[PDB]
Amino acid sequence: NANDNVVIVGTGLAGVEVAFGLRASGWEGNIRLVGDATVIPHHLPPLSKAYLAGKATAESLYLRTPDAYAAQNIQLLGGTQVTAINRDRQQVILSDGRALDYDRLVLATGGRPRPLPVASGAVGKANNFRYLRTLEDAECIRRQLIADNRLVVIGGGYIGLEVAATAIKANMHVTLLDTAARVLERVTAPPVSAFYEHLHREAGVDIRTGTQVCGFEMSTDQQKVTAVLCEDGTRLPADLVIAGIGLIPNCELASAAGLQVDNGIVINEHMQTSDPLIMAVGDCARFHSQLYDRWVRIESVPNALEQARKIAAILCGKVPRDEAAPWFWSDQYEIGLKMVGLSEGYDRIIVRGSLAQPDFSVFYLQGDRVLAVDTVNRPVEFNQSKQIITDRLPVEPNLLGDESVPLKEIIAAAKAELS
Template sequence: MRSGTGTGNAAPVVIVGAGHSGVAVAAGLRAKGWEGCILLIDAENGLPYERPPLSKELLKDGATDESAVLRKERFYADKGIDRLAGVTAASIDRNGRTVLLSDGTRQAYHRLVIATGSRARPLTVPGAGLQGVRSLRTRDDALELKRLLVPGARVAIIGAGYIGLEVAAASAARGCEVTVLEFQDRVMSRVTSAPVSCYFEKLHMRHGVRFVFGAAVTSIDGEQSFQGEQRAQSVTVADGTVFPADVVLAGIGVLPNQELAADAGLDCRDGILVDGDGRTSDPAIYASGDVTRFTSPIDGASQRLECIQNALAQADRVAAHITGQPAAEPEVPWFWTVQHGVRLQTAGVRHREDQVIVRGEPAGGKFSVVYLRGGRLAAVDTIANLADFRTAKRLVAQGALIDPALAADPGIPLADAIAGIPHHAAADLAAARS
């Protein structure tokens, strides 16, 4: 059994998972003065890398096959952070404070951090295992998908969320024939409102992407290739329509990799339950990033967020609690996606019942959508409007009451739309509170 690594004999802080959050916990521990051993366990080989480019830049024609690393190799050596690559955690012995690893060894821990992220939700229809049917979560996934996206390839994308639409944009740019099959009645319905959905649907259609809504996929059918393997040939939906497809991408969401925690008896509910410091139901075990579920300090909602901002913010709180140092103030969650060169930025978490106010004219390519909950600014979507995005982040954090009429006027700065205050004075108040 490993009792420790690096310098000293004390058991290390063991971090399971080397995505954005896991690497940030390790870096944060050192930055906050942790002098003990740190061990980072990475299921993949090579250096930990950035995830957002996998469905964007990495798929572009002519782009290098190398993804950007989170930290250079020298960083880990300089900071005394040990890494085990190509190894996973199989089980946790909470009483003994050890982790059984996939290589058969057992690793002791002083504190354990679970940052195992999430995985692509699998297709469960007949034919899902055929060659040419792909999901996108890792660098290897992206490189294999890139190899298949040749000019003229017929690409069927199941799901019109961020990943599905980003891949649709990359596929169209590479000269593929792209069809997006979405069960709901509009794109990105889980994360945004109808005006934003409509804008991006039209944007994709201008680039040749075809949409089919209300489409429930029932099977993927294939044929035998010259190499003797069964490859995808078409996708069938519930009404019997058949869509030819050489490549099928399943972009139907993700599942948290919570099994390690659940098997150890930690409280889980579509994510590992953590408090504001990232602690699980075991005080010696923390969790961070996409795998967690927590109560929002902004609006009190139970949520599991899949975004880099949350991964880094939780990592900071975990490192702070382990070291006894102060953490940064909670930040309003924010997200982004880039499709056909257009960047959608979101601050806050929209609820379906929120009041929707459009600022500006979508046809002009620069507008925002403001979401009010009980009269207070809860979230904003912005396209080519960085000023609204930055202002909205401050106002959401403040729980600012907003005058709907003022917010709907793009000629009035969003900071001047605070309810009950003359709009020429509202900006000064917002700045003073920030």
């Protein structure tokens, strides 16, 4: 109602996005954005790209100019942490004692970086040892990308690869270790891992897969790390160490309140948790994917934008929109990587173009269904693949590989013969 209080915990992309979207769909009640971060809400993708390269201003990171919040009558309560949720009393209690009343609650808590087990003690606290999840992390790391200095990145995910490529361009000596048998092991077919490994080895990255760090060596000062130690006995000397071994969803708040949790805050088709008045969105939310018929938790910008809009709709009585093809992207060196859909469980792949060039598309299929598409420097085939998945078009598999037949036509042909 126009006398209904909505409280949003977390001021990341997801949270500020339901706040402004909520106001754009007609919501008239009060809107409280409570986050523990103290900085102005900003984008994350640039923290391992242009901003890390130092080629973008801190201001260009702003999600919204700091004055747009007052203009939309969105109360932004920074530097504030929510410690608990009193469901029956229907309020959230802060650390500074205050209790906020709510009629509608949205958990947009995101996640915290998974700690590296042997980074305990003085290691984690070193200034030359860092995780890459915050603005501080990025600025702290950016100042240490000193030419000829050595860098050891631990973690094979996309952020890790984007850090290595940034460091290479900064003229650092870089080594990347992953416990998996290949980078992006779980999310990509062998040939796409091969492509990334060649690209980075060719650029000068020492990539040791199947490696597991067992400890670190510190300066006699105990203020900085000097080397990384692997289960295989090698000692990798390092001036800087960046770890990116994953994310842990911040579901504590929900678990403590009795809301069902399982590697994320569980939510239904309407984004609601076990409590009708409480919804969750973004990195922290585990939901049942309509398109893939499986419980999943996406950590991406499109997924957060999509879920926040779904929430805005539901709370404003609008009819929610169909699950869109999830997508994600990564920039490494000058290569544009764009991935739509989720490849897990594919029975085969179909390559459109040649894996020998930095220009091709990889289609992952399950039977005659397209689950996902990895594209390299192919923004247009990439964008067109979204409808294949979003609209579940029965595209002809035996044509995906024939580049003489435009993808628009192949899609158009399917979009006309759904039967």
